[PDB]
Amino acid sequence: RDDGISYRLQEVTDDAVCSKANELLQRSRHVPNKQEKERM
Amino acid sequence: ALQYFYFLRNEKDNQGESMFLRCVSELVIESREFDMLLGKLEKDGSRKPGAIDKFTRDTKTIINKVAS
């Protein structure tokens, strides 16, 4: 909000990327302008 | 020169050395700069990702062989 950190967390990111892909694919359903749907 | 040599990623030397490796090595050394290419370290131990990081996700082995 404001490296070693994410490393430690994985010890004791991919989920955010999957969330982003879910968001983009979902948003593609509502896109009226087609080229934007292809972009998404 | 980086982005170019990156195309050689599949090119192996006569010793089985990925030409990419050497070429990039001579690259770093000759160029005499790593900070911009491979990054900088922040005081709290966060490694500020540098140029090479944009091309590969496996920065570990790369920097390692460079250090060798």
PDB file of N, CA and C in Angstrom, chain B residues 2-68:
ATOM      1  N   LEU B   2      22.346  -6.953 -24.896  1.00  0.00           N
ATOM      2  CA  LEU B   2      21.640  -7.974 -24.150  1.00  0.00           C
ATOM      3  C   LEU B   2      20.505  -8.551 -24.967  1.00  0.00           C
ATOM      4  N   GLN B   3      19.501  -7.730 -25.273  1.00  0.00           N
ATOM      5  CA  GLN B   3      18.309  -8.229 -25.944  1.00  0.00           C
ATOM      6  C   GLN B   3      18.674  -9.004 -27.196  1.00  0.00           C
ATOM      7  N   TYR B   4      19.727  -8.570 -27.881  1.00  0.00           N
ATOM      8  CA  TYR B   4      20.205  -9.302 -29.044  1.00  0.00           C
ATOM      9  C   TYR B   4      20.693 -10.689 -28.657  1.00  0.00           C
ATOM     10  N   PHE B   5      21.739 -10.761 -27.833  1.00  0.00           N
ATOM     11  CA  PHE B   5      22.293 -12.055 -27.459  1.00  0.00           C
ATOM     12  C   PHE B   5      21.223 -12.981 -26.924  1.00  0.00           C
ATOM     13  N   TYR B   6      20.187 -12.414 -26.312  1.00  0.00           N
ATOM     14  CA  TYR B   6      19.074 -13.207 -25.826  1.00  0.00           C
ATOM     15  C   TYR B   6      18.518 -14.118 -26.898  1.00  0.00           C
ATOM     16  N   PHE B   7      18.635 -13.732 -28.163  1.00  0.00           N
ATOM     17  CA  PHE B   7      18.187 -14.611 -29.226  1.00  0.00           C
ATOM     18  C   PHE B   7      19.039 -15.863 -29.320  1.00  0.00           C
ATOM     19  N   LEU B   8      20.284 -15.809 -28.858  1.00  0.00           N
ATOM     20  CA  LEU B   8      21.161 -16.968 -28.861  1.00  0.00           C
ATOM     21  C   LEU B   8      20.839 -17.946 -27.743  1.00  0.00           C
ATOM     22  N   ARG B   9      19.754 -17.708 -27.001  1.00  0.00           N
ATOM     23  CA  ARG B   9      19.441 -18.509 -25.821  1.00  0.00           C
ATOM     24  C   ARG B   9      19.519 -20.003 -26.093  1.00  0.00           C
ATOM     25  N   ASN B  10      19.222 -20.426 -27.313  1.00  0.00           N
ATOM     26  CA  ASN B  10      19.289 -21.834 -27.662  1.00  0.00           C
ATOM     27  C   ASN B  10      20.658 -22.251 -28.165  1.00  0.00           C
ATOM     28  N   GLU B  11      21.593 -21.319 -28.290  1.00  0.00           N
ATOM     29  CA  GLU B  11      22.880 -21.609 -28.903  1.00  0.00           C
ATOM     30  C   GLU B  11      23.875 -22.103 -27.862  1.00  0.00           C
ATOM     31  N   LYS B  12      24.384 -23.311 -28.074  1.00  0.00           N
ATOM     32  CA  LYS B  12      25.354 -23.919 -27.181  1.00  0.00           C
ATOM     33  C   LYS B  12      26.734 -23.797 -27.796  1.00  0.00           C
ATOM     34  N   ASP B  13      27.735 -23.612 -26.945  1.00  0.00           N
ATOM     35  CA  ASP B  13      29.101 -23.515 -27.429  1.00  0.00           C
ATOM     36  C   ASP B  13      29.645 -24.901 -27.756  1.00  0.00           C
ATOM     37  N   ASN B  14      30.920 -24.941 -28.145  1.00  0.00           N
ATOM     38  CA  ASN B  14      31.574 -26.210 -28.439  1.00  0.00           C
ATOM     39  C   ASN B  14      31.849 -27.016 -27.182  1.00  0.00           C
ATOM     40  N   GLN B  15      31.781 -26.393 -26.014  1.00  0.00           N
ATOM     41  CA  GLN B  15      31.921 -27.100 -24.751  1.00  0.00           C
ATOM     42  C   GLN B  15      30.580 -27.414 -24.109  1.00  0.00           C
ATOM     43  N   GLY B  16      29.482 -27.291 -24.848  1.00  0.00           N
ATOM     44  CA  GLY B  16      28.170 -27.370 -24.249  1.00  0.00           C
ATOM     45  C   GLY B  16      27.769 -26.135 -23.478  1.00  0.00           C
ATOM     46  N   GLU B  17      28.624 -25.121 -23.433  1.00  0.00           N
ATOM     47  CA  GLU B  17      28.274 -23.873 -22.780  1.00  0.00           C
ATOM     48  C   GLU B  17      27.231 -23.130 -23.598  1.00  0.00           C
ATOM     49  N   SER B  18      26.101 -22.845 -22.971  1.00  0.00           N
ATOM     50  CA  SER B  18      25.137 -21.970 -23.607  1.00  0.00           C
ATOM     51  C   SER B  18      25.841 -20.671 -23.950  1.00  0.00           C
ATOM     52  N   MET B  19      26.026 -20.430 -25.249  1.00  0.00           N
ATOM     53  CA  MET B  19      26.682 -19.201 -25.677  1.00  0.00           C
ATOM     54  C   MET B  19      26.119 -18.010 -24.930  1.00  0.00           C
ATOM     55  N   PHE B  20      24.794 -17.965 -24.782  1.00  0.00           N
ATOM     56  CA  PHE B  20      24.164 -16.941 -23.959  1.00  0.00           C
ATOM     57  C   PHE B  20      24.955 -16.700 -22.688  1.00  0.00           C
ATOM     58  N   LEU B  21      25.314 -17.773 -21.989  1.00  0.00           N
ATOM     59  CA  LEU B  21      26.050 -17.613 -20.747  1.00  0.00           C
ATOM     60  C   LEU B  21      27.325 -16.823 -20.965  1.00  0.00           C
ATOM     61  N   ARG B  22      28.236 -17.342 -21.781  1.00  0.00           N
ATOM     62  CA  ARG B  22      29.501 -16.651 -21.977  1.00  0.00           C
ATOM     63  C   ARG B  22      29.264 -15.243 -22.475  1.00  0.00           C
ATOM     64  N   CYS B  23      28.610 -15.124 -23.622  1.00  0.00           N
ATOM     65  CA  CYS B  23      28.355 -13.819 -24.203  1.00  0.00           C
ATOM     66  C   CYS B  23      27.871 -12.842 -23.157  1.00  0.00           C
ATOM     67  N   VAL B  24      26.920 -13.251 -22.328  1.00  0.00           N
ATOM     68  CA  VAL B  24      26.441 -12.360 -21.286  1.00  0.00           C
ATOM     69  C   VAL B  24      27.533 -12.107 -20.267  1.00  0.00           C
ATOM     70  N   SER B  25      28.393 -13.088 -20.046  1.00  0.00           N
ATOM     71  CA  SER B  25      29.430 -12.900 -19.049  1.00  0.00           C
ATOM     72  C   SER B  25      30.412 -11.851 -19.510  1.00  0.00           C
ATOM     73  N   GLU B  26      31.109 -12.144 -20.602  1.00  0.00           N
ATOM     74  CA  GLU B  26      31.936 -11.145 -21.260  1.00  0.00           C
ATOM     75  C   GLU B  26      31.204  -9.823 -21.351  1.00  0.00           C
ATOM     76  N   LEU B  27      29.894  -9.871 -21.579  1.00  0.00           N
ATOM     77  CA  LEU B  27      29.112  -8.651 -21.630  1.00  0.00           C
ATOM     78  C   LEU B  27      29.221  -7.888 -20.329  1.00  0.00           C
ATOM     79  N   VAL B  28      28.845  -8.528 -19.230  1.00  0.00           N
ATOM     80  CA  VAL B  28      28.871  -7.854 -17.940  1.00  0.00           C
ATOM     81  C   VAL B  28      30.276  -7.369 -17.629  1.00  0.00           C
ATOM     82  N   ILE B  29      31.251  -8.264 -17.738  1.00  0.00           N
ATOM     83  CA  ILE B  29      32.609  -7.914 -17.361  1.00  0.00           C
ATOM     84  C   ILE B  29      33.102  -6.750 -18.193  1.00  0.00           C
ATOM     85  N   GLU B  30      33.223  -6.953 -19.499  1.00  0.00           N
ATOM     86  CA  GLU B  30      33.643  -5.892 -20.390  1.00  0.00           C
ATOM     87  C   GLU B  30      32.896  -4.608 -20.090  1.00  0.00           C
ATOM     88  N   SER B  31      31.574  -4.694 -19.973  1.00  0.00           N
ATOM     89  CA  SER B  31      30.778  -3.507 -19.713  1.00  0.00           C
ATOM     90  C   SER B  31      31.088  -2.914 -18.348  1.00  0.00           C
ATOM     91  N   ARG B  32      31.567  -3.739 -17.419  1.00  0.00           N
ATOM     92  CA  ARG B  32      32.017  -3.283 -16.107  1.00  0.00           C
ATOM     93  C   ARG B  32      30.886  -2.594 -15.346  1.00  0.00           C
ATOM     94  N   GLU B  33      29.709  -3.204 -15.408  1.00  0.00           N
ATOM     95  CA  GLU B  33      28.551  -2.731 -14.667  1.00  0.00           C
ATOM     96  C   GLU B  33      27.627  -3.905 -14.397  1.00  0.00           C
ATOM     97  N   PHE B  34      27.167  -4.027 -13.155  1.00  0.00           N
ATOM     98  CA  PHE B  34      26.210  -5.067 -12.804  1.00  0.00           C
ATOM     99  C   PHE B  34      24.954  -4.422 -12.251  1.00  0.00           C
ATOM    100  N   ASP B  35      25.149  -3.351 -11.480  1.00  0.00           N
ATOM    101  CA  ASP B  35      24.036  -2.685 -10.819  1.00  0.00           C
ATOM    102  C   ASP B  35      22.865  -2.498 -11.767  1.00  0.00           C
ATOM    103  N   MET B  36      23.096  -1.838 -12.896  1.00  0.00           N
ATOM    104  CA  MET B  36      22.005  -1.631 -13.834  1.00  0.00           C
ATOM    105  C   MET B  36      21.553  -2.948 -14.444  1.00  0.00           C
ATOM    106  N   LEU B  37      22.497  -3.824 -14.776  1.00  0.00           N
ATOM    107  CA  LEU B  37      22.139  -5.052 -15.467  1.00  0.00           C
ATOM    108  C   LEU B  37      21.443  -6.035 -14.538  1.00  0.00           C
ATOM    109  N   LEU B  38      22.014  -6.265 -13.357  1.00  0.00           N
ATOM    110  CA  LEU B  38      21.538  -7.323 -12.481  1.00  0.00           C
ATOM    111  C   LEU B  38      20.896  -6.815 -11.201  1.00  0.00           C
ATOM    112  N   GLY B  39      20.943  -5.519 -10.936  1.00  0.00           N
ATOM    113  CA  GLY B  39      20.212  -4.974  -9.813  1.00  0.00           C
ATOM    114  C   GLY B  39      21.087  -4.476  -8.688  1.00  0.00           C
ATOM    115  N   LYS B  40      20.415  -3.963  -7.665  1.00  0.00           N
ATOM    116  CA  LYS B  40      21.063  -3.462  -6.468  1.00  0.00           C
ATOM    117  C   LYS B  40      20.364  -4.028  -5.247  1.00  0.00           C
ATOM    118  N   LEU B  41      21.077  -4.034  -4.127  1.00  0.00           N
ATOM    119  CA  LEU B  41      20.515  -4.537  -2.885  1.00  0.00           C
ATOM    120  C   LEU B  41      20.120  -3.375  -1.988  1.00  0.00           C
ATOM    121  N   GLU B  42      18.918  -3.449  -1.432  1.00  0.00           N
ATOM    122  CA  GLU B  42      18.453  -2.446  -0.497  1.00  0.00           C
ATOM    123  C   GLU B  42      18.826  -2.845   0.924  1.00  0.00           C
ATOM    124  N   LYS B  43      18.880  -1.842   1.801  1.00  0.00           N
ATOM    125  CA  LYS B  43      19.410  -2.058   3.143  1.00  0.00           C
ATOM    126  C   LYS B  43      18.686  -3.178   3.876  1.00  0.00           C
ATOM    127  N   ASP B  44      17.377  -3.297   3.691  1.00  0.00           N
ATOM    128  CA  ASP B  44      16.624  -4.341   4.369  1.00  0.00           C
ATOM    129  C   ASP B  44      16.688  -5.678   3.646  1.00  0.00           C
ATOM    130  N   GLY B  45      17.625  -5.849   2.724  1.00  0.00           N
ATOM    131  CA  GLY B  45      17.772  -7.126   2.066  1.00  0.00           C
ATOM    132  C   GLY B  45      16.827  -7.384   0.920  1.00  0.00           C
ATOM    133  N   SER B  46      16.130  -6.369   0.432  1.00  0.00           N
ATOM    134  CA  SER B  46      15.388  -6.537  -0.805  1.00  0.00           C
ATOM    135  C   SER B  46      16.295  -6.262  -1.995  1.00  0.00           C
ATOM    136  N   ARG B  47      16.345  -7.216  -2.918  1.00  0.00           N
ATOM    137  CA  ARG B  47      17.181  -7.094  -4.103  1.00  0.00           C
ATOM    138  C   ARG B  47      16.409  -6.331  -5.168  1.00  0.00           C
ATOM    139  N   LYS B  48      16.824  -5.100  -5.435  1.00  0.00           N
ATOM    140  CA  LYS B  48      16.144  -4.286  -6.432  1.00  0.00           C
ATOM    141  C   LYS B  48      16.355  -4.907  -7.805  1.00  0.00           C
ATOM    142  N   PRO B  49      15.318  -5.465  -8.429  1.00  0.00           N
ATOM    143  CA  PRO B  49      15.522  -6.185  -9.690  1.00  0.00           C
ATOM    144  C   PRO B  49      16.020  -5.258 -10.780  1.00  0.00           C
ATOM    145  N   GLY B  50      17.033  -5.722 -11.510  1.00  0.00           N
ATOM    146  CA  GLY B  50      17.701  -4.916 -12.502  1.00  0.00           C
ATOM    147  C   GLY B  50      17.366  -5.343 -13.919  1.00  0.00           C
ATOM    148  N   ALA B  51      18.212  -4.891 -14.843  1.00  0.00           N
ATOM    149  CA  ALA B  51      17.924  -5.088 -16.253  1.00  0.00           C
ATOM    150  C   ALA B  51      17.699  -6.549 -16.576  1.00  0.00           C
ATOM    151  N   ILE B  52      18.689  -7.393 -16.302  1.00  0.00           N
ATOM    152  CA  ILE B  52      18.593  -8.780 -16.720  1.00  0.00           C
ATOM    153  C   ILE B  52      17.322  -9.413 -16.198  1.00  0.00           C
ATOM    154  N   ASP B  53      16.845  -8.968 -15.040  1.00  0.00           N
ATOM    155  CA  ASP B  53      15.660  -9.577 -14.459  1.00  0.00           C
ATOM    156  C   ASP B  53      14.478  -9.544 -15.406  1.00  0.00           C
ATOM    157  N   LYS B  54      14.401  -8.535 -16.267  1.00  0.00           N
ATOM    158  CA  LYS B  54      13.273  -8.438 -17.178  1.00  0.00           C
ATOM    159  C   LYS B  54      13.268  -9.574 -18.185  1.00  0.00           C
ATOM    160  N   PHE B  55      14.433 -10.126 -18.501  1.00  0.00           N
ATOM    161  CA  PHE B  55      14.497 -11.151 -19.530  1.00  0.00           C
ATOM    162  C   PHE B  55      14.329 -12.550 -18.968  1.00  0.00           C
ATOM    163  N   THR B  56      14.889 -12.826 -17.800  1.00  0.00           N
ATOM    164  CA  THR B  56      14.814 -14.162 -17.241  1.00  0.00           C
ATOM    165  C   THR B  56      14.144 -14.105 -15.884  1.00  0.00           C
ATOM    166  N   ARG B  57      13.467 -15.197 -15.540  1.00  0.00           N
ATOM    167  CA  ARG B  57      12.937 -15.350 -14.193  1.00  0.00           C
ATOM    168  C   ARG B  57      13.928 -16.060 -13.276  1.00  0.00           C
ATOM    169  N   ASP B  58      14.881 -16.793 -13.843  1.00  0.00           N
ATOM    170  CA  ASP B  58      15.864 -17.547 -13.068  1.00  0.00           C
ATOM    171  C   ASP B  58      17.143 -16.747 -12.837  1.00  0.00           C
ATOM    172  N   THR B  59      17.027 -15.552 -12.250  1.00  0.00           N
ATOM    173  CA  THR B  59      18.204 -14.711 -12.043  1.00  0.00           C
ATOM    174  C   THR B  59      19.267 -15.416 -11.216  1.00  0.00           C
ATOM    175  N   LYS B  60      18.860 -16.409 -10.424  1.00  0.00           N
ATOM    176  CA  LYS B  60      19.798 -17.057  -9.523  1.00  0.00           C
ATOM    177  C   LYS B  60      20.984 -17.626 -10.280  1.00  0.00           C
ATOM    178  N   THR B  61      20.748 -18.632 -11.121  1.00  0.00           N
ATOM    179  CA  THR B  61      21.857 -19.319 -11.769  1.00  0.00           C
ATOM    180  C   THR B  61      22.675 -18.362 -12.614  1.00  0.00           C
ATOM    181  N   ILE B  62      22.021 -17.368 -13.204  1.00  0.00           N
ATOM    182  CA  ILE B  62      22.738 -16.414 -14.034  1.00  0.00           C
ATOM    183  C   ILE B  62      23.765 -15.664 -13.206  1.00  0.00           C
ATOM    184  N   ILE B  63      23.298 -14.953 -12.185  1.00  0.00           N
ATOM    185  CA  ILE B  63      24.228 -14.216 -11.344  1.00  0.00           C
ATOM    186  C   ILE B  63      25.273 -15.155 -10.774  1.00  0.00           C
ATOM    187  N   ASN B  64      24.883 -16.397 -10.502  1.00  0.00           N
ATOM    188  CA  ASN B  64      25.809 -17.335  -9.891  1.00  0.00           C
ATOM    189  C   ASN B  64      26.975 -17.630 -10.812  1.00  0.00           C
ATOM    190  N   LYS B  65      26.691 -17.996 -12.055  1.00  0.00           N
ATOM    191  CA  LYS B  65      27.775 -18.271 -12.985  1.00  0.00           C
ATOM    192  C   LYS B  65      28.595 -17.014 -13.244  1.00  0.00           C
ATOM    193  N   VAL B  66      27.933 -15.859 -13.299  1.00  0.00           N
ATOM    194  CA  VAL B  66      28.669 -14.608 -13.427  1.00  0.00           C
ATOM    195  C   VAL B  66      29.671 -14.476 -12.298  1.00  0.00           C
ATOM    196  N   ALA B  67      29.233 -14.789 -11.087  1.00  0.00           N
ATOM    197  CA  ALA B  67      30.110 -14.688  -9.935  1.00  0.00           C
ATOM    198  C   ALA B  67      31.235 -15.705 -10.016  1.00  0.00           C
ATOM    199  N   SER B  68      30.939 -16.911 -10.497  1.00  0.00           N
ATOM    200  CA  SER B  68      31.995 -17.900 -10.692  1.00  0.00           C
ATOM    201  C   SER B  68      33.083 -17.346 -11.592  1.00  0.00           C
TER     202      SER B  68
END
